[PDB]
Design a protein around this ligand. Sequence first.
Ligand code: EQ7
Lengths: 119, 114
Amino acid sequence: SHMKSFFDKKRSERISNGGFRPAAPNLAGAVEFSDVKTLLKEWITTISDPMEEDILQVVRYCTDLIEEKDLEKLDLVIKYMKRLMQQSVESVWNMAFDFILDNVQVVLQQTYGSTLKVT
Amino acid sequence: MKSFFDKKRSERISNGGFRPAAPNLAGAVEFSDVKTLLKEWITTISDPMEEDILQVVRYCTDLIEEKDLEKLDLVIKYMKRLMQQSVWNMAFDFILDNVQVVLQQTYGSTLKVT
Ligand SMILES: CC(C)CC(=O)c1c(Nc2ccc(Cl)cc2Cl)[nH]c2c(Cl)ccc([N+](=O)[O-])c2c1=O
């Protein structure tokens, strides 16, 4: 973990699971969409310059949702980030959303490479 | 004369069975039960009714709205191999085309069906 990572700090404020990797898709230990939504809003509204490692933790959470076949939650999370990041007055948040979406769509397309043809 | 799937649904209601919460075709939820129903429909009816074709389109669209891509692909491919083995060939193309339009407009992708 890193001192300056928003999501590492949030995970350390939650009660510790013992220090083990969770199997469940999670963002800083949060699993319920209501808890994930709260963390995402706090991140985007309190951090004006998001850290690379935090952006990658969001990508990894989304790719974990894909691997869990939880596309319903993936859609909710992507739409919520789209709303908050694309409306930001900070250009870096729009760039972060583009990066997250691009990486998630590559993972989705490859995971379903035998099923889906991207137009 | 009555829709094949309407008869199934009405028979279910007379036995105390109402719509499942999960996407379903006339009450069938698990792929094993959906297969059995689709096979009965396609093998016993030589001239499928529009009303039944549209209930299958609606079931597939319910799967899309639920993001159940795995089950949508299974159902589309199962129908393909029963309906192409005539008007059933046209019915399959009609069902698939409706699904592909919804997928393209919602997500920018379509089924490969390979
Ligand atoms: C590039 C990618 C392969 C294009 C696509 O196809 C996408 C997709 N497809 C899909 C899902 C369920 C079913 Cl039933 C059928 C289909 Cl086609 N689902 C998403 C969801 Cl659920 C959330 C977020 C995104 N996202 O990242 O924008 C997508 C997405 O792109």
